[PDB]
């Protein structure tokens, strides 16, 4: 039995949660209730298997079990149409079908939160249900949310209410901590989406490379044989969490933290504090631990990678181990380099050894490789230096508008909402990284841009409308950013035509939070640039300044909401003029 296997390892609490998240992440539309039912029916079954390890079907694979349980409600196409397909299939045909149907943008209603008085009541009255509802709302909206980590956010979430509800002003104590959590989880969720896209779209070799370079930066003192050990396991973990095998992912993830803490001295000296706490907190700590100090006397890379005469021979013997080593070596001494640049260099090196080693005199040929790294290294530095300057001058909001105009011009076919979210996140790189010293700027900026551009790539993959987004997203994982930065304006885009339904206005806007207004303002700017690409940042600007005036005004006018009827036709006259 496997269900029994995992149960004993995780226990009732975690086992019950993971299965909830797994169910929530598969049938994102189904109601909380039904998920709970199935979870319990599933948990009960497990309990018997523990005793009699051959009872009913305790001999199967989680999937068959999990799959059939969901198929007791999925067959309801009237609710989940395209799902019935999946159930008519059989493992593994069935499982893939489910994974392939997860929605990165569910049509789930916004999740507003009741007043502090209700939450604390509901929390206090019934706890487990309160926290179950939390996991369900997160897992269903983030189908790739790294499960093990979601449990950590949960324990954290619980402590928020557990303390704040006993305050002198709950609202004051809760709100903050709740906000800080909503953000941090959106970040977690995106870093994870990239890892799964990598594994799924590009293959484990690509993820392995990513990991080697990332881990080598974090643990410079660790050894190549050691890192590789870690890279092998870590890859398996994610591979499981990204294929929907949550229980094993969680299990293996625990075993990995166990190992890493045991062999502490062999890996990093900054792990101590991590290994002295509860599992869930232990794991989250290791994954976020700062890099260890760099080993003192380190030889020059040129030694064994460009000057040695045995280069090509070693490359031929174990090209993967050789390139593996080159990356580990270059990464361990460059924590000031974003992981994607390290991978670009590694690819530039591989390409060179390929053409060079089949030459009349390899050495002569590959002797100047580092001369090419110079451009690759400076491109990002200059880009960051430039973009943080602009940011510092315009502030976040204005900087995001800039990126909005700029991207809409690159890929005008992309849907306005997607362009708005992505440009807003791209501009958050300013506040997130520009306040760093150049030594830490690049890894912060350029790797964060990979996570943001991946969203666009996955949101776009649902309904592809721009081959330029497809080219840049599918050509090379590591070069995505460089690809997009090269795009200028689409010369073949045929401008749109002003609609009435292209953009509705109904006064309902004067009630929305401040943020939700800039957003409505930004959504406008996008639609503008699509209707007038060839327009300039001069006109556009002056115009944006106008719209601000319209809202600030009419939202303070006492006529029936017809000040838009009259002034709405008024602005239209001005707009067409520009």
Ligand X SMILES: CCCC1C(=O)N2C(N(C)C)=Nc3ccc(C)cc3N2C1=O
Binding-site annotation: residue ranges? 2, 9, 63, 236, 240, 243, 245, 248, 251, 255
Instruction: Specify the DSSP element, H or E, that contains 10.
Output: helix 3-24
Whether omega for the bond prior to residue 552 falls within 30 degrees of 0, making it cis, is no
SS3 letters for 345-405?
A: HHHHHHHHHHHHCCCCCHHHHHCCCHHHHHHHHHHHHHHHHHHHHHHHHHHHHHHHHHHHH
CA distances to 117, 144, 322 from 224, rounded to whole Å, are 54, 30, 11
The answer to whether residue 24 forms part of the interface with ligand X (CB under 6 A) is no
The answer to whether residue 440 forms part of the interface with ligand X (CB under 6 A) is no
Among the listed residues 47, 182, 277, 435, the single contact to ligand X using CB under 6 A: 182
Residue 517 C-beta-side C-alpha neighbours within 13 Å: 16
CA distances to 483, 525, 570, 575 from 532, rounded to whole Å, are 24, 10, 19, 11
The answer to whether residue 108 forms part of the interface with ligand X (CB under 6 A) is no
The answer to whether residue 178 forms part of the interface with ligand X (CB under 6 A) is yes
> For the window 369-398, what string marks contact with ligand X as x by the rule CB under 6 A?
------------------------------
Three-state SS at 164: helix
The answer to whether residue 323 forms part of the interface with ligand X (CB under 6 A) is no
**259 vs 370, which CB is nearer to ligand X?**
259
**Who's near 20: CB < 8 A, 6+ residues apart?**
35, 36, 39, 132, 135, 136, 139
Three-state SS at 145: coil
| Alpha helices by DSSP H, 411-466 | 416-433, 438-462
Burial of residue 350, with CB atoms counted within 10 A of its CB: 0-12 exposed, 13-18 middle, 19 or more buried? middle
Selected range binding ligand X among 94-102, 180-188, 196-204, 527-535, rule: CB under 6 A: 180-188
Selected range binding ligand X among 73-81, 183-191, 316-324, 408-416, rule: CB under 6 A: 183-191
Positions 242 through 271 that interact with ligand X (CB under 6 A)? 256-257, 260
In the complex, the smallest distance separating the C-beta of residue 418 from ligand X, rounded to whole angstroms, is 15
In the complex, the smallest distance separating the C-beta of residue 454 from ligand X, rounded to whole angstroms, is 14
Among the listed residues 132, 142, 441, 480, the single contact to ligand X using CB under 6 A: 142
Q: Are 441 and 434 in contact (CB under 8 A)?
A: yes
The answer to whether residue 429 forms part of the interface with ligand X (CB under 6 A) is no
Classify residue 300 by its DSSP letter.
-
In the complex, the smallest distance separating the C-beta of residue 185 from ligand X, rounded to whole angstroms, is 2
Instruction: Give the Cα separation of 334 and 220 in Å (integer).
Output: 9
Interface size with ligand X, residues (CB under 6 A):
21
What is the biggest distance separating any 2 CA atoms in the chain, rounded to whole angstroms? 85
Q: Are 465 and 413 in contact (CB under 8 A)?
A: yes
In the complex, the smallest distance separating the C-beta of residue 379 from ligand X, rounded to whole angstroms, is 23
Instruction: Give the Cα separation of 346 and 488 in Å (integer).
Output: 27
The answer to whether residue 146 forms part of the interface with ligand X (CB under 6 A) is yes
**Mind giving me the DSSP string for 452-471?**
HHHHHHHHHHHS---HHHHH
Among the listed residues 83, 138, 346, 449, the single contact to ligand X using CB under 6 A: 138
Binding residues for Zn(2+): 63, 243, 245
In the complex, the smallest distance separating the C-beta of residue 254 from ligand X, rounded to whole angstroms, is 10
Residue 369 C-beta-side C-alpha neighbours within 13 Å: 27
Selected range binding ligand X among 136-144, 293-301, 342-350, 398-406, rule: CB under 6 A: 136-144
For the record, the structure tokens of 197 come out as: 């896209």
The answer to whether residue 185 forms part of the interface with ligand X (CB under 6 A) is yes
In the complex, the smallest distance separating the C-beta of residue 530 from ligand X, rounded to whole angstroms, is 25
Selected range binding ligand X among 16-24, 177-185, 302-310, 479-487, rule: CB under 6 A: 177-185
The answer to whether residue 189 forms part of the interface with ligand X (CB under 6 A) is yes
Among the listed residues 47, 186, 313, 440, the single contact to ligand X using CB under 6 A: 186
**86 vs 227, which CB is nearer to ligand X?**
227
Among the listed residues 141, 208, 282, 441, the single contact to ligand X using CB under 6 A: 141
> For the window 195-234, what string marks contact with ligand X as x by the rule CB under 6 A?
-------------------x---------------x---x
**Residues that bind ligand X in the complex, under the rule CB under 6 A:** 111, 113, 138, 141-142, 146, 149, 178, 181-182, 185-186, 189, 214, 230, 234, 256-257, 260, 286-287
């Amino acid at each position: 039995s496997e269900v029994a296997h995992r149960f004993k390892d995780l226990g009732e609490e975690n086992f019950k949660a993971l299965v909830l998240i797994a169910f929530a992440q598969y049938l994102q539309q189904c109601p909380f209730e039904d998920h709970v039912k199935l979870v319990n029916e599933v948990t009960e079954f497990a309990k018997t298997c523990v005793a009699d390890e051959s009872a009913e079907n305790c001999d199967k694979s989680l999937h068959t079990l999990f799959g059939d349980k969901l198929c007791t409600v999925a067959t309801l196409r009237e609710t989940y149409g395209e799902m019935a397909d999946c159930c008519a299939k059989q493992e593994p045909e069935r499982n893939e079908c489910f994974l392939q149907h997860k929605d990165d943008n569910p049509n789930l209603p916004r999740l507003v939160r009741p007043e502090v008085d209700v939450m604390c009541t509901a929390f206090h009255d019934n706890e487990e249900t309160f926290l179950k509802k939390y996991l369900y709302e997160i897992a269903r909206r983030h189908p790739y949310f790294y499960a093990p980590e979601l449990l950590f956010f949960a324990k954290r979430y619980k402590a928020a209410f557990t303390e704040c509800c006993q305050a002198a002003d709950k609202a004051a104590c809760l709100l903050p901590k709740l906000d800080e959590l909503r953000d941090e989880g959106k970040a977690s969720s995106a870093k994870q989406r990239l890892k799964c896209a990598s594994l799924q779209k590009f293959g484990e070799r690509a993820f392995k490379a990513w990991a080697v370079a990332r881990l080598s930066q974090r643990f410079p003192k660790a050894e190549f044989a050691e890192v590789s050990k870690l890279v092998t396991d870590l890859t398996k973990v994610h591979t499981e969490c990204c294929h929907g095998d949550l229980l094993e992912c969680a299990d293996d993830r625990a075993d990995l933290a166990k190992y890493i803490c045991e062999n502490q001295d062999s890996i990093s000296s900054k792990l101590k504090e991590c290994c002295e706490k509860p599992l869930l907190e232990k794991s989250h700590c290791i994954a976020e631990v700062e890099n260890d100090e760099m080993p003192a006397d380190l030889p020059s890379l040129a030694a064994d990678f460009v000057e040695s005469k045995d280069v090509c021979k070693n490359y031929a013997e174990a090209k993967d181990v050789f390139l593996g080593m080159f990356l580990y070596e270059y990464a361990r001494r460059h924590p000031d380099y974003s992981v994607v640049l390290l991978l670009r260099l590694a690819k530039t090196y591989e390409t060179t050894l390929e053409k060079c080693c089949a030459a009349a005199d390899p050495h002569e040929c590959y002797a100047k490789v580092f001369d090419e790294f110079k451009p690759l290294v400076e491109e990002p530095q200059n880009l960051i230096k430039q973009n943080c300057e602009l940011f510092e001058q315009l502030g976040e909001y204005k900087f995001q508008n800039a990126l909005l105009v700029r991207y809409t011009k690159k890929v005008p076919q992309v849907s306005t909402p997607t362009l708005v979210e992505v440009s807003r996140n791209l501009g958050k790189v300013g506040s997130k990284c520009c306040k760093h010293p150049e030594a830490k700027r690049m890894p912060c900026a350029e790797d964060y841009l990979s996570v943001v551009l991946n969203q666009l790539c996955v949101l776009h993959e649902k309904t592809p409308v721009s081959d330029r987004v497809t080219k840049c997203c599918t050509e090379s994982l590591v070069n995505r950013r460089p690809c997009f930065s090269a795009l200028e304006v689409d010369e073949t885009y045929v401008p749109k035509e002003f609609n009435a339904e292209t953009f509705t206005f109904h006064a309902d806007i004067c009630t929305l939070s401040e943020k939700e207004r800039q957003i409505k303002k930004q959504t406008a700017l996008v639609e503008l640039v699509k209707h007038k690409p060839k327009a300039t940042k001069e006109q556009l600007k002056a115009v944006m300044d106008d719209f601000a005036a319209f809202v600030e005004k009419c939202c303070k006018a006492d006529d029936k909401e017809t000040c838009f009827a009259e002034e709405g036709k008024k602005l239209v006259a001005a707009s067409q003029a520009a």
